[PDB]
Amino acid sequence: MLYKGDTLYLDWLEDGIAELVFDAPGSVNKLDTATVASLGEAIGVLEQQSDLKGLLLRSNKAAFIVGADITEFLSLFLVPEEQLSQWLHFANSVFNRLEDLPVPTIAAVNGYALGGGCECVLATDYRLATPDLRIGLPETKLGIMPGFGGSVRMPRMLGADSALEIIAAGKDVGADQALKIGLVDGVVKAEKLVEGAKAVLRQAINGDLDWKAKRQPKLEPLKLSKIEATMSFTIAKGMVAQTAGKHYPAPITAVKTIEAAARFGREEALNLENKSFVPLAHTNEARALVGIFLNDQYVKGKAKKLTKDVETPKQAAVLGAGIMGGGIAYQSAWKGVPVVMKDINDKSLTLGMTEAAKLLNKQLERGKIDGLKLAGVISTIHPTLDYAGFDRVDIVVEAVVENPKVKKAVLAETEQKVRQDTVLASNTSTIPISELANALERPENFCGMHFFNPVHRMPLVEIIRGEKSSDETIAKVVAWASKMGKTPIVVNDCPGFFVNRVLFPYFAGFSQLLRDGADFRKIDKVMEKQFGWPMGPAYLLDVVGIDTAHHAQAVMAAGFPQRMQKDYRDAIDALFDANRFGQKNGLGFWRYKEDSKGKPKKEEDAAVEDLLAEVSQPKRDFSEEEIIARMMIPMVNEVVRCLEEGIIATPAEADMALVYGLGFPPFHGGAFRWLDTLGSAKYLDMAQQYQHLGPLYEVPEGLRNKARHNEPYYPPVEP
Ligand SMILES: Nc1ncnc2c1ncn2[C@@H]1O[C@H](COP(=O)(O)OP(=O)(O)OP(=O)(O)O)[C@@H](O)[C@H]1O
Numbered sequence: 001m002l003y004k005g006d007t008l009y010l011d012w013l014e015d016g017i018a019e020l021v022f023d024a025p026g027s028v029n030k031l032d033t034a035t036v037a038s039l040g041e042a043i044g045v046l047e048q049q050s051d052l053k054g055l056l057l058r059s060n061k062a063a064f065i066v067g068a069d070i071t072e073f074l075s076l077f078l079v080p081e082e083q084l085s086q087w088l089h090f091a092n093s094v095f096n097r098l099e100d101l102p103v104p105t106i107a108a109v110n111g112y113a114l115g116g117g118c119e120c121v122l123a124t125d126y127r128l129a130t131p132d133l134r135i136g137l138p139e140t141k142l143g144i145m146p147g148f149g150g151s152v153r154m155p156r157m158l159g160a161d162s163a164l165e166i167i168a169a170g171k172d173v174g175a176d177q178a179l180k181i182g183l184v185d186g187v188v189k190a191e192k193l194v195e196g197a198k199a200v201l202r203q204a205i206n207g208d209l210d211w212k213a214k215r216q217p218k219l220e221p222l223k224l225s226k227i228e229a230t231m232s233f234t235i236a237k238g239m240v241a242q243t244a245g246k247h248y249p250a251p252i253t254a255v256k257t258i259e260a261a262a263r264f265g266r267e268e269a270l271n272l273e274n275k276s277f278v279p280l281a282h283t284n285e286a287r288a289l290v291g292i293f294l295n296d297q298y299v300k301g302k303a304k305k306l307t308k309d310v311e312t313p314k315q316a317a318v319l320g321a322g323i324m325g326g327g328i329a330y331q332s333a334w335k336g337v338p339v340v341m342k343d344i345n346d347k348s349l350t351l352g353m354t355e356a357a358k359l360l361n362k363q364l365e366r367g368k369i370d371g372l373k374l375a376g377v378i379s380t381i382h383p384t385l386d387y388a389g390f391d392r393v394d395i396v397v398e399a400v401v402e403n404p405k406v407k408k409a410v411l412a413e414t415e416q417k418v419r420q421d422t423v424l425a426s427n428t429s430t431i432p433i434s435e436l437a438n439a440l441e442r443p444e445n446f447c448g449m450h451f452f453n454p455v456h457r458m459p460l461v462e463i464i465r466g467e468k469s470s471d472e473t474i475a476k477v478v479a480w481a482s483k484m485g486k487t488p489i490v491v492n493d494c495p496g497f498f499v500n501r502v503l504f505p506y507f508a509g510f511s512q513l514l515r516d517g518a519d520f521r522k523i524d525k526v527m528e529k530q531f532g533w534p535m536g537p538a539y540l541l542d543v544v545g546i547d548t549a550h551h552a553q554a555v556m557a558a559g560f561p562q563r564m565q566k567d568y569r570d571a572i573d574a575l576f577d578a579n580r581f582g583q584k585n586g587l588g589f590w591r592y593k594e595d596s597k598g599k600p601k602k603e604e605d606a607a608v609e610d611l612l613a614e615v616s617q618p619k620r621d622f623s624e625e626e627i628i629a630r631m632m633i634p635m636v637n638e639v640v641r642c643l644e645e646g647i648i649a650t651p652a653e654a655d656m657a658l659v660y661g662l663g664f665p666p667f668h669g670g671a672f673r674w675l676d677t678l679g680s681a682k683y684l685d686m687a688q689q690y691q692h693l694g695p696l697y698e699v700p701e702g703l704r705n706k707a708r709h710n711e712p713y714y715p716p717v718e719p
Contacts, residue, residue, distance in 0.1 A: 415442070
């Protein structure tokens with residue numbers, strides 16, 4: 001053969017047509033730094049063969065090219081801007097040489113073709129795909145942008161409108177959409193893919209297809225009028241501004257460069273893509289978004305290891321079938337594991353089966369599941385009032401009232417209606433698992449399985465290990481949590497566990513701000529519009545319930561009297577005593593009127609200000625820095641203690657718990673990512689100003705040691 005590399009090879013085939021195959025040593029092919037180089041040597045061989053009449057690009061793997069190697073991304077983000085620009089300029093010169101070959105080219109695209117993989121197939125003149133194709137440029141989801149001609153070829157291939165939507169939103173289209181749009185020239189089955197991708201090629205060599213007329217639009221300015229240009233780009237700039245006033249600069253950057261690079265050739269369009277990819281690759285957001293992907297692949301990787309030799313449970317059950325019970329029953333049955341949902345009255349069983357069917361109805365809305373086959377999974381949910389079928393279940397969760405007496409009572413009973421080797425789980429929001437373990441005969445089959453509202457939207461399943469929770473029981477809990485399409489995390493037992501434990505000091509600092517005379521309406525503004533929380537402290541406290549927060553603040557105070565007990569009377573107490581419980585009864589920090597569709601909207605109350613002035617000092621204007629610091633320091637100080645105390649295993653698990661459990665802003669990456677993005681020693685000097693407010697603002701000794709040398713929590717890793 002002509003050229004053989006570690007990840008790809010090149011050989012003659014058929015009748016004077018070459019064949020470049022991406023055959024990586026692993027399971028998926030990626031355009032890593034070596035593969036881009038190995039491609040450069042392969043194309044150069046094609047440039048010195050006078051007998052060349054055709055070129056075919058294909059893959060021996062299930063997919064085509066998964067993309068660039070993300071394990072190199074954090075290292076690529078660190079090289080200086082000039083060096084990264086020069087490399088990207090010459091990495092683009094590789095694909096330009098693929099595109100400029102004096103020969104009809106085509107890529108037989110199979111399976112996935114994301115990121116650099118799609119940018120590769122755009123260089124060829126023709127593209128032929130398979131019915132299982134998924135193709136797109138999801139580079140803005142990681143904070144960067146198409147760097148290998150994606151923002152140049154796709155706008156000139158698909159028309160500006162369709163390319164702006166794919167690139168900015170970072171989406172991938174299917175086999176049917178790609179042909180309709182223009183990404184794909186034809187769809188054939190994988191068997192006929194290799195042969196069919198040479199039939200289209202030999203139409204081109206015999207002059208039937210004008211291939212350099214099809215190649216030409218990718219080299220020329222966009223065929224858009226001034227009126228069409230301004231129209232097309234405000235739709236993209238408007239659809240990007242739709243996404244909640246982004247702190248994310250990647251989607252708007254990707255759009256604005258394609259706009260600036262319109263009416264330009266391929267050289268300047270690649271130049272404007274290059275000059276904007278490098279600054280994006282250096283943004284703290286791009287590091288945090290890529291760090292989330294690697295941490296996600298590590299969390300789910302650790303999942304397969306714990307669950308490597310434990311069979312998944314076949315029959316499941318939930319105890320507590322309200323809205324949360326319907327979500328737990330839906331999510332388990334919707335992914336192939338039956339459920340047994342039981343309450344104490346039928347009005348909750350209907351309300352649970354109702355909610356469980358609404359979630360399936362949304363799957364019927366689009367991405368349709370067969371309504372005939374939709375009934376095949378709600379029929380898998382059985383609303384029982386007695387203990388029917390509990391003999392034939394393998395695991396069960398308790399999603400009952402937040403009350404230790406009822407939890408211990410209903411756990412010891414359902415234990416008796418259930419076999420010995422069967423596993424029990426608890427969705428307690430705050431009660432420690434080791435305490436509930438004393439009310440069971442077989443504690444070795446009991447642990448904490450903790451969902452988060454909204455259950456279907458928040459994918460974290462906080463899994464807590466009791467003192468006698470064995471290792472086999474947790475693997476069964478992690479196995480079921482994974483099969484439900486949920487991202488699980490294992491923590492050690494303590495009151496509040498990790499997610500709800502670190503969130504309370506965030507609330508305590510909110511009560512301490514209001515006590516010092518702050519405005520809860522502006523505090524919610526700063527935490528939502530600037531830090532990026534989906535909901536600020538006060539608004540969130542109303543959807544948790546002012547009394548649920550009032551009760552949870554008492555549980556966390558008896559568990560951590562060292563530093564989680566307050567001396568004064570706060571907003572949570574004053575609001576609770578006025579029977580204002582939040583969105584629950586429509587009265588809380590705000591007033592919640594029913595809107596037209598039924599989504600309660602927050603409107604201001606007059607009696608809430610006069611009620612807060614009793615528990616507060618005179619109104620004091622705090623800066624956004626004071627608000628952000630006084631709200632975030634007690635939380636991150638807590639997530640660090642959960643690391644040193646062994647509650648959470650690693651910084652990667654803690655950040656994924658915050659991102660997927662509390663909706664921690666992904667562009668911040670997490671508390672530890674934010675703690676590394678900010679100066680590790682700078683954090684102590686920032687926190688020393690507020691160290692006198694309470695023991696929560698006192699940085700733990702472990703971080704106080706690392707702040708001596710500005711030591712981070714994420715070690716710089718190799719790929
Ligand atoms: N003694 C009990 N034994 C078993 N289950 C119970 C008991 N009391 C309540 N439950 C169940 O616990 C679930 C939640 O109870 P409930 O509706 O009282 O929630 P809640 O915590 O009071 O919420 P809110 O305070 O917002 O109304 C319900 O499914 C209910 O059937």
